[PDB]
Enzyme design. Structure first.
Site, mmCIF file in Angstrom:
data_model
loop_
_atom_site.group_PDB
_atom_site.id
_atom_site.type_symbol
_atom_site.label_atom_id
_atom_site.label_comp_id
_atom_site.label_asym_id
_atom_site.label_seq_id
_atom_site.Cartn_x
_atom_site.Cartn_y
_atom_site.Cartn_z
ATOM 1 N N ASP A 1 1.171 -1.263 -0.157
ATOM 2 C CA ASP A 1 0.417 -0.284 -0.297
ATOM 3 C C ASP A 1 0.842 0.746 0.051
ATOM 4 O OD1 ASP A 1 -2.482 0.454 0.789
ATOM 5 O OD2 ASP A 1 -1.509 2.488 2.119
ATOM 6 N N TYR B 1 2.762 10.544 0.541
ATOM 7 C CA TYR B 1 4.363 9.451 1.408
ATOM 8 C C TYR B 1 5.546 9.764 0.690
ATOM 9 C CZ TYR B 1 0.389 6.456 2.321
ATOM 10 O OH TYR B 1 -0.896 6.021 3.301
ATOM 11 N N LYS C 1 -2.353 6.358 -4.890
ATOM 12 C CA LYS C 1 -3.888 6.949 -3.474
ATOM 13 C C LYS C 1 -3.397 8.368 -4.984
ATOM 14 C CE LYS C 1 -3.793 4.689 0.453
ATOM 15 N NZ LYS C 1 -2.547 4.388 0.591
ATOM 16 N N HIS D 1 -7.276 9.372 -2.334
ATOM 17 C CA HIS D 1 -7.182 9.457 -1.373
ATOM 18 C C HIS D 1 -7.785 10.307 0.047
ATOM 19 C CE1 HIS D 1 -2.841 8.517 1.269
ATOM 20 N NE2 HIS D 1 -3.682 9.246 1.610
ATOM 21 N N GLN E 1 -10.581 2.217 1.783
ATOM 22 C CA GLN E 1 -9.679 2.093 2.472
ATOM 23 C C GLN E 1 -9.994 3.302 3.558
ATOM 24 O OE1 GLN E 1 -4.593 3.113 2.736
ATOM 25 N NE2 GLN E 1 -4.932 2.127 1.270
HETATM 26 N N1 NAP Z 1 -5.838 6.387 3.298
HETATM 27 C C1 NAP Z 1 -5.589 7.082 4.023
HETATM 28 O O1 NAP Z 1 -5.432 7.378 4.857
HETATM 29 C C2 NAP Z 1 -4.144 5.939 5.680
HETATM 30 C C3 NAP Z 1 -3.912 6.818 6.305
HETATM 31 C C4 NAP Z 1 -3.264 6.459 7.441
HETATM 32 C C5 NAP Z 1 -2.768 4.808 7.058
HETATM 33 N N2 NAP Z 1 -3.373 4.480 5.377
HETATM 34 C C6 NAP Z 1 -1.845 3.101 4.998
HETATM 35 O O2 NAP Z 1 -2.410 2.056 6.128
HETATM 36 C C7 NAP Z 1 -0.766 1.494 6.809
HETATM 37 C C8 NAP Z 1 -0.814 1.271 8.438
HETATM 38 O O3 NAP Z 1 -1.201 1.998 8.847
HETATM 39 P P1 NAP Z 1 -0.154 3.050 9.861
HETATM 40 O O4 NAP Z 1 0.954 3.167 9.086
HETATM 41 O O5 NAP Z 1 -0.950 4.759 10.431
HETATM 42 O O6 NAP Z 1 -0.421 2.455 11.137
HETATM 43 P P2 NAP Z 1 -0.540 0.854 12.077
HETATM 44 O O7 NAP Z 1 0.633 -0.589 10.788
HETATM 45 O O8 NAP Z 1 -1.453 0.686 12.907
HETATM 46 O O9 NAP Z 1 1.411 1.628 12.998
HETATM 47 C C9 NAP Z 1 2.368 1.699 12.310
HETATM 48 C C10 NAP Z 1 3.763 1.445 13.594
HETATM 49 O O10 NAP Z 1 3.246 0.235 14.222
HETATM 50 C C11 NAP Z 1 4.460 -0.495 14.627
HETATM 51 N N3 NAP Z 1 4.119 -1.728 14.298
HETATM 52 C C12 NAP Z 1 4.036 -2.750 12.980
HETATM 53 N N4 NAP Z 1 4.162 -3.589 13.662
HETATM 54 C C13 NAP Z 1 4.044 -3.800 15.272
HETATM 55 C C14 NAP Z 1 4.174 -5.050 16.183
HETATM 56 N N5 NAP Z 1 4.340 -6.067 15.691
HETATM 57 N N6 NAP Z 1 4.842 -4.749 17.075
HETATM 58 C C15 NAP Z 1 4.536 -3.514 17.126
HETATM 59 N N7 NAP Z 1 4.617 -2.361 16.550
HETATM 60 C C16 NAP Z 1 5.205 -2.431 15.473
HETATM 61 C C17 NAP Z 1 5.115 0.116 13.551
HETATM 62 O O11 NAP Z 1 7.020 0.995 14.162
HETATM 63 P P3 NAP Z 1 8.360 -0.054 12.820
HETATM 64 O O12 NAP Z 1 7.163 0.962 11.597
HETATM 65 O O13 NAP Z 1 9.142 1.045 13.780
HETATM 66 O O14 NAP Z 1 8.590 -1.141 13.136
HETATM 67 C C18 NAP Z 1 4.314 1.405 13.202
HETATM 68 O O15 NAP Z 1 5.465 3.011 13.935
HETATM 69 C C19 NAP Z 1 -0.103 3.470 6.806
HETATM 70 O O16 NAP Z 1 1.023 2.005 6.633
HETATM 71 C C20 NAP Z 1 -0.487 3.084 4.919
HETATM 72 O O17 NAP Z 1 -0.324 2.666 4.261
HETATM 73 C C21 NAP Z 1 -3.753 5.383 5.144
HETATM 74 O O1 388 Z 2 -2.679 9.092 4.595
HETATM 75 C C1 388 Z 2 -1.888 8.244 5.412
HETATM 76 O O2 388 Z 2 -0.672 7.523 5.938
HETATM 77 C C2 388 Z 2 -1.105 9.552 7.236
HETATM 78 O O3 388 Z 2 -2.005 10.874 6.129
HETATM 79 C C3 388 Z 2 -0.995 12.173 6.100
HETATM 80 C C4 388 Z 2 0.277 11.337 4.935
HETATM 81 C C5 388 Z 2 1.577 11.505 4.628
HETATM 82 CL CL1 388 Z 2 2.449 11.236 4.810
HETATM 83 C C6 388 Z 2 1.111 13.567 5.461
HETATM 84 C C7 388 Z 2 0.586 13.790 5.395
HETATM 85 C C8 388 Z 2 -1.277 13.550 5.670
HETATM 86 C C9 388 Z 2 -2.591 14.106 6.602
HETATM 87 O O4 388 Z 2 -3.295 13.758 6.625
HETATM 88 N N1 388 Z 2 -1.451 14.746 7.457
HETATM 89 C C10 388 Z 2 -2.963 16.030 7.970
HETATM 90 C C11 388 Z 2 -2.974 16.906 7.262
HETATM 91 C C12 388 Z 2 -2.696 18.358 7.153
HETATM 92 C C13 388 Z 2 -3.116 19.459 6.810
HETATM 93 C C14 388 Z 2 -3.935 19.131 5.690
HETATM 94 BR BR1 388 Z 2 -4.380 20.903 4.591
HETATM 95 C C15 388 Z 2 -3.895 18.421 5.341
HETATM 96 C C16 388 Z 2 -3.558 16.599 5.459
HETATM 97 F F1 388 Z 2 -3.923 15.786 5.665
#
Ligand code: NAP
Ligand code: 388
Length: 316
Positions: free
Chosen positions: A44, A49, A78, A111, A184
Protein backbone atom coordinates in the site's frame (compact mmCIF):
# COMPACT_ATOMS: atom_id res chain seq x y z
CA UNK A 1 1.40 -16.08 2.41
CA UNK A 2 -2.04 -14.45 2.65
CA UNK A 3 -5.52 -15.54 1.62
CA UNK A 4 -7.48 -13.22 -0.67
CA UNK A 5 -10.62 -11.14 -0.81
CA UNK A 6 -12.24 -11.25 -4.24
CA UNK A 7 -13.10 -7.88 -5.78
CA UNK A 8 -16.08 -7.21 -8.03
CA UNK A 9 -13.63 -7.30 -10.96
CA UNK A 10 -12.77 -10.84 -9.85
CA UNK A 11 -9.16 -9.77 -9.20
CA UNK A 12 -7.75 -11.26 -5.99
CA UNK A 13 -6.62 -8.75 -3.34
CA UNK A 14 -4.27 -10.27 -0.74
CA UNK A 15 -5.88 -9.84 2.69
CA UNK A 16 -2.67 -8.62 4.38
CA UNK A 17 -0.66 -5.84 2.73
CA UNK A 18 2.38 -3.77 3.69
CA UNK A 19 1.74 -0.17 4.75
CA UNK A 20 4.40 2.40 3.80
CA UNK A 21 3.28 5.69 5.37
CA UNK A 22 6.21 7.25 7.26
CA UNK A 23 8.51 4.50 6.10
CA UNK A 24 11.79 6.45 5.86
CA UNK A 25 14.02 6.48 2.79
CA UNK A 26 16.86 4.10 3.52
CA UNK A 27 14.52 1.76 5.31
CA UNK A 28 11.46 1.42 3.03
CA UNK A 29 13.47 -0.35 0.32
CA UNK A 30 14.66 -3.02 2.77
CA UNK A 31 11.17 -3.11 4.27
CA UNK A 32 9.59 -3.98 0.90
CA UNK A 33 12.28 -6.58 0.14
CA UNK A 34 11.81 -8.26 3.55
CA UNK A 35 8.01 -8.27 3.11
CA UNK A 36 8.22 -9.95 -0.31
CA UNK A 37 10.67 -12.53 1.06
CA UNK A 38 8.16 -13.11 3.85
CA UNK A 39 5.27 -13.65 1.45
CA UNK A 40 3.66 -10.21 1.25
CA UNK A 41 2.31 -9.52 -2.25
CA UNK A 42 0.10 -6.50 -1.48
CA UNK A 43 1.92 -3.17 -0.99
CA UNK A 44 0.00 0.00 0.00
CA UNK A 45 1.52 3.21 -1.31
CA UNK A 46 0.70 6.89 -1.83
CA UNK A 47 1.97 9.95 -3.67
CA UNK A 48 1.85 11.98 -0.47
CA UNK A 49 4.20 9.56 1.33
CA UNK A 50 6.94 10.78 -1.02
CA UNK A 51 8.72 7.42 -0.91
CA UNK A 52 7.26 5.65 -3.96
CA UNK A 53 10.59 5.93 -5.81
CA UNK A 54 12.27 3.77 -3.16
CA UNK A 55 9.36 1.30 -2.95
CA UNK A 56 9.76 1.06 -6.74
CA UNK A 57 13.45 0.23 -6.45
CA UNK A 58 12.69 -2.60 -4.02
CA UNK A 59 9.86 -4.11 -6.11
CA UNK A 60 12.07 -3.98 -9.21
CA UNK A 61 14.96 -5.81 -7.48
CA UNK A 62 12.71 -8.63 -6.34
CA UNK A 63 11.14 -8.94 -9.76
CA UNK A 64 14.51 -9.01 -11.54
CA UNK A 65 15.87 -11.53 -8.99
CA UNK A 66 12.92 -13.84 -9.76
CA UNK A 67 11.70 -13.70 -6.14
CA UNK A 68 8.25 -12.68 -7.34
CA UNK A 69 6.42 -12.04 -10.64
CA UNK A 70 4.57 -8.78 -11.35
CA UNK A 71 1.19 -10.47 -11.88
CA UNK A 72 1.45 -11.84 -8.35
CA UNK A 73 2.18 -8.44 -6.80
CA UNK A 74 -0.78 -6.25 -5.86
CA UNK A 75 0.25 -2.59 -5.87
CA UNK A 76 -2.05 0.18 -4.66
CA UNK A 77 -1.50 3.93 -4.74
CA UNK A 78 -3.58 7.04 -4.03
CA UNK A 79 -4.44 10.35 -5.65
CA UNK A 80 -3.88 13.27 -3.27
CA UNK A 81 -6.74 15.84 -3.20
CA UNK A 82 -4.61 18.72 -4.53
CA UNK A 83 -4.81 16.84 -7.82
CA UNK A 84 -8.57 16.59 -8.55
CA UNK A 85 -8.47 18.87 -11.57
CA UNK A 86 -8.44 16.64 -14.68
CA UNK A 87 -4.94 17.43 -16.11
CA UNK A 88 -3.41 17.11 -12.62
CA UNK A 89 -4.89 13.63 -12.06
CA UNK A 90 -2.88 12.43 -15.04
CA UNK A 91 0.36 14.20 -14.07
CA UNK A 92 0.18 13.00 -10.45
CA UNK A 93 -0.56 9.43 -11.60
CA UNK A 94 2.32 9.44 -14.06
CA UNK A 95 4.66 10.59 -11.27
CA UNK A 96 3.34 7.81 -9.02
CA UNK A 97 3.66 5.21 -11.81
CA UNK A 98 7.16 6.41 -12.81
CA UNK A 99 8.37 6.44 -9.20
CA UNK A 100 7.11 2.87 -8.68
CA UNK A 101 8.75 1.79 -11.95
CA UNK A 102 5.59 -0.08 -12.91
CA UNK A 103 3.59 -0.38 -16.11
CA UNK A 104 0.27 -0.46 -14.23
CA UNK A 105 -1.27 -0.18 -10.74
CA UNK A 106 -3.59 -2.86 -9.39
CA UNK A 107 -5.78 -0.30 -7.57
CA UNK A 108 -5.76 3.52 -7.61
CA UNK A 109 -7.61 5.27 -4.77
CA UNK A 110 -8.98 8.71 -4.14
CA UNK A 111 -7.04 9.43 -0.93
CA UNK A 112 -9.59 11.84 0.57
CA UNK A 113 -13.04 12.93 -0.70
CA UNK A 114 -12.61 16.69 -0.04
CA UNK A 115 -10.75 18.63 -2.72
CA UNK A 116 -7.85 20.84 -1.62
CA UNK A 117 -6.41 23.86 -3.44
CA UNK A 118 -5.03 22.43 -6.67
CA UNK A 119 -1.29 22.21 -7.20
CA UNK A 120 1.97 20.94 -5.79
CA UNK A 121 1.52 22.42 -2.35
CA UNK A 122 0.25 19.18 -0.80
CA UNK A 123 -0.95 20.86 2.39
CA UNK A 124 -2.39 24.28 1.56
CA UNK A 125 -3.45 25.78 4.92
CA UNK A 126 -4.48 29.11 6.40
CA UNK A 127 -2.58 30.89 9.22
CA UNK A 128 -4.31 28.69 11.78
CA UNK A 129 -3.58 25.44 9.98
CA UNK A 130 -6.98 24.86 8.39
CA UNK A 131 -7.05 23.17 4.96
CA UNK A 132 -7.72 25.39 1.95
CA UNK A 133 -10.33 23.87 -0.40
CA UNK A 134 -10.25 23.64 -4.19
CA UNK A 135 -13.29 23.66 -6.47
CA UNK A 136 -12.55 20.34 -8.22
CA UNK A 137 -14.47 17.48 -6.58
CA UNK A 138 -13.90 13.76 -6.10
CA UNK A 139 -16.30 13.12 -8.98
CA UNK A 140 -14.09 15.30 -11.19
CA UNK A 141 -11.11 13.21 -10.14
CA UNK A 142 -13.02 9.98 -10.67
CA UNK A 143 -13.78 10.92 -14.27
CA UNK A 144 -10.08 11.42 -14.91
CA UNK A 145 -9.09 8.16 -13.16
CA UNK A 146 -11.60 6.18 -15.25
CA UNK A 147 -9.44 7.03 -18.28
CA UNK A 148 -6.51 5.25 -16.65
CA UNK A 149 -8.63 2.11 -16.44
CA UNK A 150 -9.76 2.50 -20.07
CA UNK A 151 -6.07 2.64 -21.01
CA UNK A 152 -5.15 -0.28 -18.75
CA UNK A 153 -2.78 1.79 -16.64
CA UNK A 154 -4.94 0.89 -13.63
CA UNK A 155 -6.83 -2.39 -13.20
CA UNK A 156 -9.36 -1.04 -10.68
CA UNK A 157 -10.38 2.15 -8.87
CA UNK A 158 -11.22 2.65 -5.22
CA UNK A 159 -11.80 5.20 -2.51
CA UNK A 160 -10.38 6.05 0.87
CA UNK A 161 -11.88 7.85 3.87
CA UNK A 162 -15.34 7.90 2.29
CA UNK A 163 -18.54 7.82 4.32
CA UNK A 164 -21.51 5.87 2.97
CA UNK A 165 -23.00 9.18 1.83
CA UNK A 166 -20.07 9.88 -0.46
CA UNK A 167 -20.01 6.32 -1.78
CA UNK A 168 -23.70 6.70 -2.57
CA UNK A 169 -22.89 9.98 -4.39
CA UNK A 170 -20.29 8.07 -6.43
CA UNK A 171 -22.41 4.97 -7.10
CA UNK A 172 -25.45 7.07 -8.04
CA UNK A 173 -23.55 9.35 -10.43
CA UNK A 174 -25.30 9.26 -13.85
CA UNK A 175 -22.83 7.86 -16.40
CA UNK A 176 -20.41 6.07 -14.06
CA UNK A 177 -17.96 3.80 -15.94
CA UNK A 178 -16.22 2.03 -13.06
CA UNK A 179 -17.27 1.21 -9.49
CA UNK A 180 -14.93 1.44 -6.46
CA UNK A 181 -13.52 -1.98 -5.55
CA UNK A 182 -12.51 -0.93 -2.03
CA UNK A 183 -12.96 1.78 0.59
CA UNK A 184 -9.76 2.18 2.60
CA UNK A 185 -10.56 3.52 6.08
CA UNK A 186 -9.24 3.46 9.64
CA UNK A 187 -10.39 0.30 11.37
CA UNK A 188 -9.41 -1.43 14.63
CA UNK A 189 -11.15 -2.46 17.90
CA UNK A 190 -11.74 1.16 19.06
CA UNK A 191 -13.28 2.03 15.69
CA UNK A 192 -14.96 -1.12 14.47
CA UNK A 193 -16.80 0.49 11.53
CA UNK A 194 -19.68 -1.96 11.80
CA UNK A 195 -22.17 0.18 9.85
CA UNK A 196 -19.73 1.22 7.11
CA UNK A 197 -18.44 -2.34 6.55
CA UNK A 198 -22.04 -3.64 6.33
CA UNK A 199 -22.88 -0.91 3.79
CA UNK A 200 -19.77 -1.47 1.63
CA UNK A 201 -20.16 -5.25 1.48
CA UNK A 202 -23.80 -4.83 0.44
CA UNK A 203 -22.65 -2.73 -2.54
CA UNK A 204 -19.94 -5.21 -3.47
CA UNK A 205 -17.20 -2.95 -2.13
CA UNK A 206 -14.47 -4.47 0.05
CA UNK A 207 -12.97 -2.62 3.01
CA UNK A 208 -9.27 -2.04 3.63
CA UNK A 209 -8.40 -1.38 7.28
CA UNK A 210 -5.68 1.21 7.80
CA UNK A 211 -3.90 1.98 11.10
CA UNK A 212 -4.86 -1.48 12.42
CA UNK A 213 -2.38 -1.17 15.29
CA UNK A 214 -3.56 2.30 16.30
CA UNK A 215 -0.73 3.96 14.36
CA UNK A 216 1.30 4.35 17.63
CA UNK A 217 4.03 6.50 16.06
CA UNK A 218 1.77 9.14 14.43
CA UNK A 219 2.94 12.74 14.96
CA UNK A 220 -0.37 14.19 16.23
CA UNK A 221 -0.45 11.60 19.03
CA UNK A 222 -1.17 13.10 22.45
CA UNK A 223 -0.13 11.22 25.64
CA UNK A 224 -3.74 10.49 26.69
CA UNK A 225 -4.59 8.67 23.45
CA UNK A 226 -5.67 5.01 23.90
CA UNK A 227 -3.05 2.34 23.14
CA UNK A 228 -4.29 -0.85 21.46
CA UNK A 229 -0.97 -2.73 21.71
CA UNK A 230 -0.79 -2.05 25.42
CA UNK A 231 -4.51 -2.74 25.95
CA UNK A 232 -4.77 -5.41 28.69
CA UNK A 233 -7.93 -6.83 27.12
CA UNK A 234 -6.24 -7.10 23.74
CA UNK A 235 -3.12 -8.60 25.36
CA UNK A 236 -5.34 -11.11 27.17
CA UNK A 237 -6.63 -12.58 23.91
CA UNK A 238 -3.11 -12.63 22.47
CA UNK A 239 -1.84 -14.54 25.54
CA UNK A 240 -4.61 -17.12 25.05
CA UNK A 241 -3.11 -18.05 21.66
CA UNK A 242 0.55 -17.49 22.55
CA UNK A 243 0.55 -14.73 19.92
CA UNK A 244 1.27 -11.00 19.99
CA UNK A 245 -1.27 -8.19 20.41
CA UNK A 246 -0.38 -7.05 16.88
CA UNK A 247 -1.10 -10.51 15.47
CA UNK A 248 -4.53 -10.44 17.17
CA UNK A 249 -5.26 -6.90 15.87
CA UNK A 250 -4.46 -8.02 12.32
CA UNK A 251 -6.29 -11.37 12.55
CA UNK A 252 -9.36 -9.43 13.74
CA UNK A 253 -9.79 -7.95 10.25
CA UNK A 254 -9.04 -11.18 8.36
CA UNK A 255 -11.95 -12.80 10.18
CA UNK A 256 -14.38 -10.09 9.07
CA UNK A 257 -13.14 -10.56 5.51
CA UNK A 258 -11.58 -7.11 5.69
CA UNK A 259 -8.20 -6.43 4.05
CA UNK A 260 -5.61 -4.99 6.46
CA UNK A 261 -2.38 -3.08 5.82
CA UNK A 262 -0.09 -2.91 8.88
CA UNK A 263 2.98 -0.68 8.41
CA UNK A 264 6.45 -1.56 9.59
CA UNK A 265 10.07 -1.11 8.56
CA UNK A 266 11.32 -3.53 11.22
CA UNK A 267 12.10 -6.94 9.67
CA UNK A 268 11.02 -8.91 12.78
CA UNK A 269 7.68 -7.08 12.92
CA UNK A 270 7.15 -7.31 9.16
CA UNK A 271 7.41 -11.10 9.50
CA UNK A 272 5.36 -11.17 12.73
CA UNK A 273 2.54 -9.22 11.09
CA UNK A 274 1.92 -11.93 8.43
CA UNK A 275 2.12 -14.94 10.80
CA UNK A 276 -1.67 -14.64 11.14
CA UNK A 277 -2.86 -17.75 9.30
CA UNK A 278 -1.96 -20.43 11.89
CA UNK A 279 -4.51 -19.45 14.55
CA UNK A 280 -8.17 -18.48 14.83
CA UNK A 281 -9.96 -16.01 17.11
CA UNK A 282 -13.06 -17.69 18.58
CA UNK A 283 -16.57 -16.30 18.09
CA UNK A 284 -16.55 -15.12 21.68
CA UNK A 285 -13.15 -13.43 21.29
CA UNK A 286 -14.34 -11.68 18.14
CA UNK A 287 -17.46 -10.54 19.99
CA UNK A 288 -15.33 -9.31 22.88
CA UNK A 289 -13.05 -7.29 20.59
CA UNK A 290 -16.00 -5.73 18.73
CA UNK A 291 -17.34 -4.49 22.07
CA UNK A 292 -14.23 -2.35 22.45
CA UNK A 293 -15.67 0.10 19.89
CA UNK A 294 -15.23 3.70 21.02
CA UNK A 295 -15.63 5.46 17.66
CA UNK A 296 -12.09 6.75 18.24
CA UNK A 297 -10.05 7.95 15.25
CA UNK A 298 -6.28 8.30 15.32
CA UNK A 299 -6.68 10.06 11.96
CA UNK A 300 -9.35 12.79 12.37
CA UNK A 301 -8.12 15.44 9.87
CA UNK A 302 -10.12 18.02 11.85
CA UNK A 303 -8.15 20.78 10.10
CA UNK A 304 -10.49 20.18 7.13
CA UNK A 305 -13.85 19.79 8.92
CA UNK A 306 -15.04 23.07 7.42
CA UNK A 307 -14.96 21.83 3.83
CA UNK A 308 -17.83 20.37 1.83
CA UNK A 309 -17.24 16.61 1.68
CA UNK A 310 -15.84 16.02 5.18
CA UNK A 311 -16.53 12.33 5.75
CA UNK A 312 -16.48 12.03 9.55
CA UNK A 313 -19.49 14.22 10.40
CA UNK A 314 -21.93 11.51 9.28
CA UNK A 315 -22.64 8.54 11.57
CA UNK A 316 -21.10 6.28 8.90
N1 NAP B 1 -5.66 6.08 3.28
C1 NAP B 1 -5.22 6.80 4.31
O1 NAP B 1 -5.61 7.94 4.51
C2 NAP B 1 -4.25 6.18 5.25
C3 NAP B 1 -4.04 6.74 6.51
C4 NAP B 1 -3.14 6.12 7.37
C5 NAP B 1 -2.51 4.96 6.95
N2 NAP B 1 -2.72 4.42 5.73
C6 NAP B 1 -2.03 3.18 5.28
O2 NAP B 1 -2.14 2.14 6.26
C7 NAP B 1 -0.85 1.76 6.77
C8 NAP B 1 -0.94 1.37 8.25
O3 NAP B 1 -1.39 2.42 9.11
P1 NAP B 1 -0.35 3.29 10.01
O4 NAP B 1 1.01 3.25 9.36
O5 NAP B 1 -0.99 4.62 10.22
O6 NAP B 1 -0.25 2.62 11.48
P2 NAP B 1 -0.22 1.06 11.96
O7 NAP B 1 0.10 0.08 10.85
O8 NAP B 1 -1.43 0.87 12.84
O9 NAP B 1 1.06 1.10 12.93
C9 NAP B 1 2.38 1.33 12.46
C10 NAP B 1 3.28 1.49 13.68
O10 NAP B 1 3.27 0.29 14.46
C11 NAP B 1 4.57 -0.28 14.56
N3 NAP B 1 4.45 -1.76 14.42
C12 NAP B 1 4.27 -2.46 13.29
N4 NAP B 1 4.20 -3.78 13.60
C13 NAP B 1 4.32 -3.90 14.94
C14 NAP B 1 4.32 -4.99 15.83
N5 NAP B 1 4.17 -6.26 15.40
N6 NAP B 1 4.47 -4.75 17.15
C15 NAP B 1 4.63 -3.50 17.61
N7 NAP B 1 4.64 -2.44 16.79
C16 NAP B 1 4.48 -2.62 15.45
C17 NAP B 1 5.39 0.40 13.48
O11 NAP B 1 6.75 0.56 13.88
P3 NAP B 1 7.96 0.33 12.84
O12 NAP B 1 7.42 0.79 11.52
O13 NAP B 1 9.04 1.23 13.41
O14 NAP B 1 8.27 -1.14 12.91
C18 NAP B 1 4.73 1.74 13.31
O15 NAP B 1 5.26 2.68 14.24
C19 NAP B 1 0.03 2.96 6.46
O16 NAP B 1 1.44 2.69 6.42
C20 NAP B 1 -0.52 3.40 5.11
O17 NAP B 1 0.02 2.58 4.05
C21 NAP B 1 -3.58 5.01 4.89
O1 388 C 1 -2.54 8.82 4.52
C1 388 C 1 -1.78 8.60 5.48
O2 388 C 1 -1.06 7.57 5.52
C2 388 C 1 -1.75 9.59 6.64
O3 388 C 1 -2.01 10.92 6.17
C3 388 C 1 -0.96 11.75 5.88
C4 388 C 1 0.20 11.20 5.35
C5 388 C 1 1.29 12.01 5.05
CL1 388 C 1 2.78 11.29 4.37
C6 388 C 1 1.24 13.39 5.27
C7 388 C 1 0.08 13.93 5.80
C8 388 C 1 -1.01 13.13 6.10
C9 388 C 1 -2.21 13.81 6.67
O4 388 C 1 -3.32 13.32 6.55
N1 388 C 1 -1.97 14.97 7.29
C10 388 C 1 -2.90 15.86 7.95
C11 388 C 1 -3.17 17.10 7.11
C12 388 C 1 -2.72 18.35 7.55
C13 388 C 1 -2.97 19.49 6.78
C14 388 C 1 -3.68 19.39 5.59
BR1 388 C 1 -4.06 20.89 4.50
C15 388 C 1 -4.13 18.14 5.16
C16 388 C 1 -3.89 17.01 5.91
F1 388 C 1 -4.36 15.83 5.43
Amino acid sequence: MATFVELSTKAKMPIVGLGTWKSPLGKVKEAVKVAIDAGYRHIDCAYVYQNEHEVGEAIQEKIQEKAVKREDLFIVSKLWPTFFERPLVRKAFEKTLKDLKLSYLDVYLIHWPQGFKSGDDLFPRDDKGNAIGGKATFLDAWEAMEELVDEGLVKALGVSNFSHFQIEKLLNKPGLKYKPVTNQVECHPYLTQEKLIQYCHSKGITVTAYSPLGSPDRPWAKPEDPSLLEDPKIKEIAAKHKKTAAQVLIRFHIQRNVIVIPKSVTPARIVENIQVFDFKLSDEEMATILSFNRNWRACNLLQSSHLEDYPFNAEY
